[PDB]
Amino acid sequence: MDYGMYFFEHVTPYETLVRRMERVIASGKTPFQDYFLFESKGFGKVLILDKDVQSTERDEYIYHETLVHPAMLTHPEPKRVLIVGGGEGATLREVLKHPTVEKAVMVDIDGELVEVAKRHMPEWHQGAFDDPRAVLVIDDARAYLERTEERYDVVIIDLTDPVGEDNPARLLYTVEFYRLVKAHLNPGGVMGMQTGMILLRVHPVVHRTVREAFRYVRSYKNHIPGFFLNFGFLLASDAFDPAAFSEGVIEARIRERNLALRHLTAPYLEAMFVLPKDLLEALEKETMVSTDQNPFYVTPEGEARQAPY
Amino acid sequence: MDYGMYFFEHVTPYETLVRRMERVIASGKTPFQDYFLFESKGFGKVLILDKDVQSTERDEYIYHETLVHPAMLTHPEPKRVLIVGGGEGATLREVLKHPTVEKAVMVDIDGELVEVAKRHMPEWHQGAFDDPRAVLVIDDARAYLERTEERYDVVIIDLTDPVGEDNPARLLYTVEFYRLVKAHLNPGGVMGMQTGMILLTHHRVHPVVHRTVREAFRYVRSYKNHIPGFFLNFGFLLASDAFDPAAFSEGVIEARIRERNLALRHLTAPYLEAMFVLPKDLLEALEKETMVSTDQNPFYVTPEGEARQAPYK
Amino acid sequence: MDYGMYFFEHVTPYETLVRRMERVIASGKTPFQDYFLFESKGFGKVLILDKDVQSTERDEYIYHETLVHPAMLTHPEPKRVLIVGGGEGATLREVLKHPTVEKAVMVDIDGELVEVAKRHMPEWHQGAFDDPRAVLVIDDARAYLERTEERYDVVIIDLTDPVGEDNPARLLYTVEFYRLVKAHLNPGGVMGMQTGMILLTHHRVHPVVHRTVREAFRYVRSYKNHIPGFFLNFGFLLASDAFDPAAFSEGVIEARIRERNLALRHLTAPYLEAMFVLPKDLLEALEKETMVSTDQNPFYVTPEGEARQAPYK
Amino acid sequence: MDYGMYFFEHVTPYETLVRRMERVIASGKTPFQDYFLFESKGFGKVLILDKDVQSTERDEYIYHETLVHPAMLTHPEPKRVLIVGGGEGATLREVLKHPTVEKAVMVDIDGELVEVAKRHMPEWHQGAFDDPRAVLVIDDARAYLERTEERYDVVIIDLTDPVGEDNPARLLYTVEFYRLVKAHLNPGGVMGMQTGMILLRVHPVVHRTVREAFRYVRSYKNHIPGFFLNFGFLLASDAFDPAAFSEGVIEARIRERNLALRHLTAPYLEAMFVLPKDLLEALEKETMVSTDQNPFYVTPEGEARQAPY
Secondary structure, eight states: OOSEEEEEEESSSSEEEEEEOSEEEEEEEOSSOEEEEEEETTTEEEEEETTEEEEETTTHHHHHHHHHHHHHHHSSOOOEEEEEEOTTSHHHHHHTTSTTOOEEEEEESOHHHHHHHHHHOHHHHTTGGGOTTEEEEESOHHHHHHHOOOOEEEEEEEOOOOBSTTOGGGGGSSHHHHHHHHHTEEEEEEEEEEEEEEOOOHHHHHHHHHHTTOSEEEEEEEEEGGGTEEEEEEEEESSSOTTOOOTTHHHHHHHHTTOOOSSOOHHHHHHTTOOOHHHHHHHHHOOOOOOSSSOEEEOTTSOEEEOOO | OOSEEEEEEEOSSSEEEEEEOSEEEEEEEOSSOEEEEEEETTTEEEEEETTEEEEETTTHHHHHHHHHHHHHHHSSSOOEEEEEEOTTSHHHHHHHTSTTOSEEEEEESOHHHHHHHHHHOHHHHTTGGGOTTEEEEESOHHHHHHTOOOOEEEEEEEOOOOBSTTOGGGGGSSHHHHHHHHTTEEEEEEEEEEEEEOOTTTOOHHHHHHHHHHTTOSEEEEEEEEEGGGTEEEEEEEEESSSOTTOOOHHHHHHHHHHTTOOOSSOOHHHHHHTTOOOHHHHHHHHHOOOOOOSSSOEEEOTTSOEEEOOOO | OOSEEEEEEEOSSSEEEEEEOSEEEEEEEOSSOEEEEEEETTTEEEEEETTEEEEETTTHHHHHHHHHHHHHHHSSSOOEEEEEEOTTSHHHHHHHTSTTOSEEEEEESOHHHHHHHHHHOHHHHTTGGGOTTEEEEESOHHHHHHTOOOOEEEEEEEOOOOBSTTOGGGGGSSHHHHHHHHTTEEEEEEEEEEEEEOOTTTOOHHHHHHHHHHTTOSEEEEEEEEEGGGTEEEEEEEEESSSOTTOOOHHHHHHHHHHTTOOOSSOOHHHHHHTTOOOHHHHHHHHHOOOOOOSSSOEEEOTTSOEEEOOOO | OOSEEEEEEESSSSEEEEEEOSEEEEEEEOSSOEEEEEEETTTEEEEEETTEEEEETTTHHHHHHHHHHHHHHHSSOOOEEEEEEOTTSHHHHHHTTSTTOOEEEEEESOHHHHHHHHHHOHHHHTTGGGOTTEEEEESOHHHHHHHOOOOEEEEEEEOOOOBSTTOGGGGGSSHHHHHHHHHTEEEEEEEEEEEEEEOOOHHHHHHHHHHTTOSEEEEEEEEEGGGTEEEEEEEEESSSOTTOOOTTHHHHHHHHTTOOOSSOOHHHHHHTTOOOHHHHHHHHHOOOOOOSSSOEEEOTTSOEEEOOO
């Protein structure tokens, strides 16, 4: 590789990605995490939060379409949506493409980070924060949910894995959190979320934990170019099986809502739910359920742990 | 990050993978490429060829099942099979799992590398080289095919990308090479192959390989799968003149899997079928690609990981 | 090791220095070289030129004192001084500390780089560029000297190694360049310069520079000092036709230091003298070296960090 | 840099050396530390102990001549020598070159490591272990010294810096240890040692600690190519000032003892004791003295610490 500026990205405890930085646009520290935003010749702008890549300019459409539309499209008519996380503004951008959306509330803990995105990541938000239907709330998701009582048709959880024992993210991955979320869902409501990278137990544990809160839980996956990783996601609902696709339905909705998709197609979306034998077994055998009493977290070595926070 | 032994693996001109080595099993240089085999805590043994990871002990089953079975299963009764590349022996291993196979010819240019696999990579070959149905040929697959008139039902191409202008392997990625391969296929034959990483923002190797193959075969169908140990989404393809290789029936593939008592750890009939469902961006990249590699102007991979063409010799 | 921003610095073909960057101050590319200036926790601001560290905020005083004072102090009364290179402005700074100096001409080819120093590296120049006695010339030092007939008492050469065959700076390391420099020295003049890293097992750049200078000057004396921020032992040299630059007296240098009220943070009279005492292996390397860089066959540094010669143009 | 096998060497908390490995000769773990021996094109064979380079084939003569001869040459007639550390066998090799040496005892804690050197590092020992005057003892230096009562003309300490709070090396860098060493010195005896890297407080602390045990302590330094570092060393004695060089004396001894030196010369040896203004100030201002009660160690960030072991 060429000499020069590079960022050392943690991927696993045995593999590290060294990404070339052409120029550093912004780097700093908020009261919640460190951030690094740099120009790369391949993926364009890259945002690092702490030690892990958070998003890249040229592949984020894949991640955000994958994260948002399966839940939005499986819901016959989403009017009110709640986004937990998604600080770059792109999750909101995709949510706002559905014409039935009347209100989209985004709740994020780090206001300073959101400001970084607003000023240096216009490629992501593309003016979504200034949409009259959008409402930004800087606060702790649980705190907000515990206080508020408004309900939603769709809730999109776009958070980072609870890696690290002292990581407060642990409290956002417990069965109680998912029940709190479910409490804020209108009848027929669906929840969509990024559920950790998949590599030969974060995703299976999250799937199992969510299943302790919802009747129907369906894992789906997609390779995210800029992360160099296969990521797991899931849809959850008590009102119906979100992955029981009826012939032609998803396709009809995409056309009807005039969604401008660059990555997904109706058939590709449904194919994301077709899982390989090894993943199915991992999901099937998982027994750990994260709880407020004993919140699960991943060790630096990538192991599933559980004990009081 | 920690201190210790690591391997700096080329991925792209802007991204490098630094893999921790627990201990080095073997390293060396054949007249064709450099090789390194080491123990990693996450993926077990890792084989590096020159500057790129070639295979991983703990995830190779995913790569080899993906590479081999779609072609083998789309064929109603594969009896004669040709393997180009696959020096580790795992490709042959998967081919040999099909009881209809009577003969499997494997031709690869680097005999020394094959020897390293035989000695240090039993996890891959699992004895496949010694199968009575297996015939190992160390030679240029192109010279071998022109010098022979044997026919095959299925041909699997398992080679690394042709990096570098001076790389003679460029001649194994031209339209006349694929035409030569097609000339050795029985009437209902099918070719299956690994067709390069997919990273549309960086380069279009996969679409160039697909476009080149389309110039030699009537029906060409790309499929993809994420290879864990490579940290890359890989493209593959099925090609045939006799039929649209992706015009399945989940039912028929399922029945053939059961019939042949195929032991699969990654693929299932429905997942195999789903690999052929592509996203909009990949479809567009495949559709718009115009580069066709030919003996006159063979394509190669530039140090920037881009597909480029230039007159040979 | 930790995750975060780092700079991969070239040191040798087999050793690379990975330096943690706290934050990046400036980075860019002039028509001559790439530059990067960043904050490091250990050495403060670090300036990288292309792929090699050029200077460190916390240790530059060691490098600049070592580079400048031996020549300036061996001269009884340096009034006119020429500086070739030293774009940061710290070389000029040290030259200007000598109150006998009436004029200091600095010629460097990269004006944009000098501008980066002026704006982001005040720790180095400390206002030297604005000294009434300082004259800044942006130009090829060779074209400038041939186009002028001014004379100097001391000449300091502060340039990076000429890496690469196509590097026009190769012409600033030939015997005719040093002869040109000698042609602009007053009768008792002396030339002092940084003469490449010393790493005898890897290459002989320093001995090649010394051997080349010996072909233009009667008396040539190498001296060395370890530069903390470079993690390398560096060679330097003093050259003159008028006297053996190392035929000191600790007493005289001490008196000149006191006389000129030189504020030194690294050197002392006895330490400066000791830099000229070399070990057996270095002496032998210097003695046996036969390579003489000339305009006809200028020497350059190969990608393997070796000194090689080849006919120009 | 080229892709390939590399070793990540800690140097400081902000600088890391990535050294290319052409081939790995041997790698493993003893009950005391990890070891990595590899071929490098520049320095030849390189031995890594834990995370730091211990020695390189093509530059070790510089380190070992620098470590051994100043103490040996400043002693008018060394007959009995004690080496603490120096497991590669090269320290013994240099000591054995002095014809007045009748006995040289080498004490090292890691017998398995010594075996690694014997089998894979012949370039270092060059048969020195098989010299009739050599005696290898595998044991804890202090334990050995506390039990034994034999005395020596010269003691050479070739140990690694006490970096890390739990590092047992701390107990070999206390004023009590140096007093124990001094107790095993014949009258007129001298002690020579590697005293840590020098970089803008390990060396100054060791110098100060040793001075709390010996009347005359003289620091000297030399750049060690293979370490990419300036290293500090020191000579200590109660009988005389080891650095008060009388004209022509060192030179006469080298000739008289027919020493085959490749790096040192009499004038260069004496020049190693000429220190720069900044180093002299650091040595002068240092106030920390390592004690058995509160053994000093260096923090991962390179800071001088002191507390009970």
